[PDB]
Amino acid sequence: GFKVKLEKRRNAINTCLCIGLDPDEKDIENFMKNEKENNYNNIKKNLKEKYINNVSIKKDILLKAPDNIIRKSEEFFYFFNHFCFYIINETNKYALTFKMNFAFYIPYGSVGIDVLKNVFDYLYELNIPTILDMKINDIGNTVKNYRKFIFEYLKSDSCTVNIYMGTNMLKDICYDEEKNKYYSAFVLVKTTNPDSAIFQKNLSLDNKQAYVIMAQEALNMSSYLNLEQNNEFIGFVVGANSYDEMNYIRTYFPNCYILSPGIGAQNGDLHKTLTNGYHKSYEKILINIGRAITKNPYPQKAAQMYYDQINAILKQNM
Amino acid sequence: GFKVKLEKRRNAINTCLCIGLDPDEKDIENFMKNEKENNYNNIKKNLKEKYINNVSIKKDILLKAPDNIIKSEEFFYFFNHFCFYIINETNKYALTFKMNFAFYIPYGSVGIDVLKNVFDYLYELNIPTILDMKINDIGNTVKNYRKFIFEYLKSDSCTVNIYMGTNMLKDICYDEEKNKYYSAFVLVKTTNPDSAIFQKNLSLDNKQAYVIMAQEALNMSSYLNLEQNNEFIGFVVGANSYDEMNYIRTYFPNCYILSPGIGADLHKTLTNGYHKSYEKILINIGRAITKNPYPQKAAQMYYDQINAILKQNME
């Protein structure tokens, strides 16, 4: 159960920080250059973690001494994967959950999917709850394959879902009738893009905005599937800077799980966000911080500072 | 541009058949069993085709003989060879091929290698492509999908879900640094039985969400000058959704439509969707061909039925 994992871990480390691990090409290139310039300090640190031996793919390459890698076809893979372990290693004591957005692992072909699998293998050993932000949607017969990839192959605890096509697809994502398995998901409700209102707000039904209608139908399906009775849920992606919508959501669905992306290095207001979505069991208000951590040259420092700020706001609210 | 490629292939082969290539694990396993019990007849045909010698990934694995193969690479080998079999058998009937990404991802990286080989193979054959992935994210994030689909795969088009918004199309159908343009089909009315809940029951000013969404997609298309660059944004409209198909062809007369959902009435769809430039009504047929006992014959069949309806609408 994602619910119980979250609950347990939230008790252990007292926070709702979700760390986003979305490495782009410059992150990888910058990491490789800086490891070359500095005796490969961090990769050498990566290699000392017990949990690095338990990843699935190209262990023989990953566990080589950096020095031997340039002495090269496997180099992009090695620095990419090692960048991801580096973030995880530096920041994990501060993160209630990690969220990996699939778009960042696909553009190079398959090599990034290997990286993605290893990252998920690694987080599984560390028992850190995971989310795959992939905003999946298709017909039922088709999405089973996404279910398989995400929950069987990656062993993610949850994923993001776009339910514009409908809520029946959740039957083949959050439930596996053959194996009697249940899975958690966050459906898109109010997103962070500037023009998010065009459909989510400007469409309506019976006097209610589309985002509200969507949220309610998502929970009707969660209830029909008995998810929470099996320690899973369907939650809502609500943008961090959508304060009215977040307020509407926490108000109308008082016990929902919210995943909140949007706060970066140069925007956002953690106090207004966390307050609007607050819940005493604040694993229900996941505050995702991604680039503000992964693009900081001192990622542990970033993850700690965000941790402390959120913690201060949580106590303010208590 | 996708427009040009479509226009030219349509005149060349006289159809709007879109062939779906969505191989499931059972397709792969069965192809493997059937090749093994039949002296690898289809694989031998695969190895005699010009452009298998031109694939990017693990080419010398694919050109080995099953006996050499039969084993970490076994799955890779029969998966890829299944795809190539379907393409070799059916390509002369297809205006376009649509690969659904979901069928290529569930085994990890091995399936993405098959996907790339499939795309490189259809590119050599000069057959127009669609990646059905229904991508959506924020602008800065979807650029990764653009790169993957349009740079790495070299797809002509993909499917997009614009419920988050249409600004995302700016980083999918356009690359401002490179001055490049690409085509997409946005989801308008999909084939799922409950598709009405949002697509029909939500409205703005009386109009159903799907019409609002189609219009906004076309608004963004003009903002990006796709037409002037031989690309477009089109609409996915399910084969089973006649009134909606009718409404779209009626209200947006010259739009491009991709229509999934004809399983195993084609007349009804093609008639409601019809356009004299019939590459504007792509009729997708996947499982009904790929899970037929004789895919080539199944493809010809649908090809001949489509052709007879086209001529009947022309007349």
Side-chain angles (χ1 to χ4, degrees):
Chain A
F2 197 39
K3 292 174 76 185
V4 162
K5 231 161 169 288
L6 283 185
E7 196 174 344
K8 181 183 189 158
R9 198 177 157 73
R10 179 225 69 208
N11 206 42
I13 74 177
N14 309 293
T15 191
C16 59
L17 177 60
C18 174
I19 296 186
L21 179 53
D22 294 352
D24 68 27
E25 209 177 72
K26 295 318 294 275
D27 297 319
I28 296 161
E29 291 173 355
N30 176 49
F31 176 70
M32 186 178 114
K33 178 162 200 145
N34 284 69
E35 292 305 286
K36 281 170 175 185
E37 285 195 325
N38 296 297
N39 307 352
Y40 306 102
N41 283 313
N42 294 306
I43 292 167
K44 280 186 320 183
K45 286 171 193 178
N46 285 349
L47 294 169
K48 302 169 178 178
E49 298 304 337
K50 292 251 262 298
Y51 312 95
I52 203 177
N53 306 258
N54 301 338
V55 301
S56 296
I57 304 154
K58 284 151 101 160
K59 262 172 55 150
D60 59 309
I61 304 294
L62 265 175
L63 297 249
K64 287 198 76 58
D67 28 281
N68 304 332
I69 296 303
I70 88 169
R71 289 187 81 254
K72 168 63 186 208
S73 61
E74 313 296 309
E75 191 195 43
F76 178 72
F77 169 80
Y78 183 92
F79 287 93
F80 188 1
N81 213 149
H82 277 284
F83 174 73
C84 295
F85 293 166
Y86 157 65
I87 297 300
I88 290 162
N89 289 334
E90 289 297 301
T91 68
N92 72 85
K93 70 198 175 204
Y94 301 123
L96 181 59
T97 192
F98 277 93
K99 176 178 83 68
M100 276 58 68
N101 187 316
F102 180 91
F104 291 92
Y105 299 76
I106 200 66
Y108 316 104
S110 72
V111 64
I113 303 308
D114 294 326
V115 179
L116 185 63
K117 164 67 166 149
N118 281 348
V119 163
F120 270 84
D121 282 347
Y122 196 66
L123 290 171
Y124 196 90
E125 295 295 315
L126 298 179
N127 205 34
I128 293 184
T130 45
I131 305 167
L132 191 76
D133 192 356
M134 192 183 180
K135 298 180 180 66
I136 54 155
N137 60 309
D138 211 302
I139 72 184
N141 189 69
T142 296
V143 278
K144 285 181 320 206
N145 296 290
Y146 287 135
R147 193 184 58 204
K148 179 157 179 98
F149 174 57
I150 289 177
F151 300 111
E152 292 183 35
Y153 188 78
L154 295 178
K155 298 213 270 51
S156 189
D157 299 310
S158 69
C159 77
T160 63
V161 180
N162 181 323
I163 62 161
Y164 180 62
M165 292 179 57
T167 60
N168 264 228
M169 69 162 86
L170 294 171
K171 288 171 196 171
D172 290 291
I173 294 154
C174 297
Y175 182 45
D176 186 349
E177 208 177 51
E178 155 172 340
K179 307 206 202 185
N180 200 51
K181 303 290 151 266
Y182 292 89
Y183 303 113
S184 293
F186 294 88
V187 308
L188 307 182
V189 179
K190 178 67 179 46
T191 57
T192 66
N193 41 300
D195 60 335
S196 48
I198 65 181
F199 305 125
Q200 294 158 23
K201 307 256 287 152
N202 291 342
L203 293 158
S204 68
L205 165 78
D206 302 333
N207 300 328
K208 294 161 161 283
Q209 288 172 109
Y211 84 89
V212 183
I213 296 294
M214 200 156 285
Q216 177 60 268
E217 290 292 336
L219 287 188
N220 292 356
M221 189 56 64
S222 183
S223 184
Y224 168 93
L225 296 172
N226 301 307
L227 290 182
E228 302 220 20
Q229 149 198 331
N230 296 263
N231 293 339
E232 306 286 4
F233 53 88
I234 289 162
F236 310 139
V237 184
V238 176
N241 322 295
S242 302
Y243 306 116
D244 289 344
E245 288 72 19
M246 177 76 73
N247 187 67
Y248 193 102
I249 295 289
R250 173 60 61 214
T251 287
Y252 206 107
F253 314 102
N255 291 315
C256 72
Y257 290 87
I258 305 184
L259 170 62
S260 202
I263 294 161
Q266 292 175 135
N267 78 292
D269 174 354
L270 268 167
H271 183 281
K272 188 153 190 44
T273 298
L274 190 51
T275 297
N276 276 296
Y278 174 80
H279 190 281
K280 69 191 164 286
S281 324
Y282 46 77
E283 76 271 30
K284 299 176 173 274
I285 179 45
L286 293 172
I287 298 298
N288 177 77
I289 302 290
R291 291 170 251 167
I293 286 170
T294 56
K295 297 189 159 296
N296 190 302
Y298 290 179
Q300 181 178 117
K301 170 219 184 183
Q304 179 169 61
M305 293 183 73
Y306 282 102
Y307 175 89
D308 293 341
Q309 292 153 330
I310 285 152
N311 170 187
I313 296 152
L314 287 177
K315 168 270 137 203
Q316 236 171 319
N317 286 274
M318 275 176 80
Chain B
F2 196 36
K3 262 155 95 142
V4 157
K5 277 160 136 270
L6 287 176
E7 285 164 13
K8 178 177 190 297
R9 192 168 165 82
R10 182 218 63 213
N11 184 46
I13 67 183
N14 308 97
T15 200
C16 63
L17 176 51
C18 170
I19 292 177
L21 185 52
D22 296 348
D24 64 28
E25 217 191 320
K26 199 185 283 185
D27 294 322
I28 309 305
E29 289 169 323
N30 287 341
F31 178 78
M32 173 174 74
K33 177 157 195 186
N34 286 136
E35 287 304 274
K36 281 182 183 181
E37 295 173 8
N38 286 255
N39 209 57
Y40 308 98
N41 186 220
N42 295 308
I43 290 175
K44 295 200 285 192
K45 314 210 222 173
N46 288 347
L47 300 175
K48 293 201 292 165
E49 285 301 326
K50 191 147 281 184
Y51 293 111
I52 197 178
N53 295 292
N54 272 12
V55 283
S56 302
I57 308 156
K58 288 166 168 189
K59 185 193 302 177
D60 288 68
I61 298 293
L62 294 178
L63 274 280
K64 286 157 110 69
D67 321 75
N68 263 32
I69 292 287
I70 280 67
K71 79 93 52 270
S72 57
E73 302 293 6
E74 190 188 59
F75 189 78
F76 171 70
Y77 175 92
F78 286 100
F79 190 176
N80 210 145
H81 270 290
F82 175 68
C83 294
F84 282 167
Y85 157 67
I86 296 293
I87 295 174
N88 296 148
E89 288 290 305
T90 64
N91 68 85
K92 68 177 158 190
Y93 306 111
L95 183 54
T96 159
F97 269 88
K98 190 172 68 81
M99 286 48 72
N100 191 309
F101 185 80
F103 292 85
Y104 296 90
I105 199 43
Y107 319 104
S109 57
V110 69
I112 299 318
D113 283 347
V114 180
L115 189 62
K116 170 60 169 149
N117 281 345
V118 164
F119 269 76
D120 287 344
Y121 192 73
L122 297 162
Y123 191 92
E124 297 286 29
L125 298 174
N126 236 96
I127 298 165
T129 53
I130 308 153
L131 185 72
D132 194 351
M133 197 175 174
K134 307 191 167 57
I135 58 175
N136 64 120
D137 215 303
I138 60 165
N140 186 77
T141 295
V142 290
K143 293 174 182 72
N144 298 298
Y145 290 134
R146 192 187 54 207
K147 173 157 164 159
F148 174 59
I149 301 167
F150 300 115
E151 282 172 44
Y152 180 77
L153 288 186
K154 280 179 283 150
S155 189
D156 302 305
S157 60
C158 67
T159 57
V160 179
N161 178 330
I162 60 169
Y163 179 79
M164 292 178 56
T166 49
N167 271 349
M168 82 175 57
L169 294 164
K170 297 173 174 187
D171 300 302
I172 297 170
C173 299
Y174 179 53
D175 183 345
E176 178 154 51
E177 91 184 37
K178 303 190 204 216
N179 190 26
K180 275 180 198 324
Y181 303 82
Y182 312 112
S183 289
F185 295 91
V186 296
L187 309 178
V188 172
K189 176 73 174 39
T190 56
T191 59
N192 51 301
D194 65 331
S195 56
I197 60 183
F198 301 135
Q199 303 176 3
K200 317 260 292 141
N201 304 339
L202 288 169
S203 45
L204 160 154
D205 302 340
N206 303 133
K207 309 210 145 170
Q208 301 173 74
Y210 79 90
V211 178
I212 295 310
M213 205 164 280
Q215 176 55 253
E216 221 59 74
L218 299 188
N219 293 346
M220 190 52 71
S221 200
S222 49
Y223 181 80
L224 299 172
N225 316 307
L226 297 192
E227 182 209 31
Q228 92 183 200
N229 292 92
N230 290 2
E231 303 293 345
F232 57 83
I233 285 162
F235 313 139
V236 185
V237 186
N240 66 344
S241 310
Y242 304 122
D243 292 342
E244 291 78 19
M245 184 70 79
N246 181 228
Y247 189 98
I248 278 143
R249 180 53 70 206
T250 296
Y251 192 108
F252 307 94
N254 296 309
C255 75
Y256 292 76
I257 302 166
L258 171 63
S259 191
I262 296 286
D265 175 24
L266 183 37
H267 194 296
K268 266 206 72 63
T269 307
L270 188 49
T271 288
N272 281 301
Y274 180 80
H275 197 278
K276 67 300 299 162
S277 300
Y278 48 86
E279 75 274 12
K280 290 169 193 265
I281 176 53
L282 289 167
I283 297 294
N284 173 72
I285 313 295
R287 282 173 277 186
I289 291 166
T290 58
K291 298 187 170 291
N292 188 264
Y294 209 151
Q296 185 258 105
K297 302 301 303 327
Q300 171 160 50
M301 178 185 69
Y302 289 112
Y303 174 91
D304 293 330
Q305 294 170 355
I306 285 164
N307 193 273
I309 287 148
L310 286 175
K311 301 252 161 141
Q312 202 175 1
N313 278 280
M314 286 172 211
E315 284 175 339

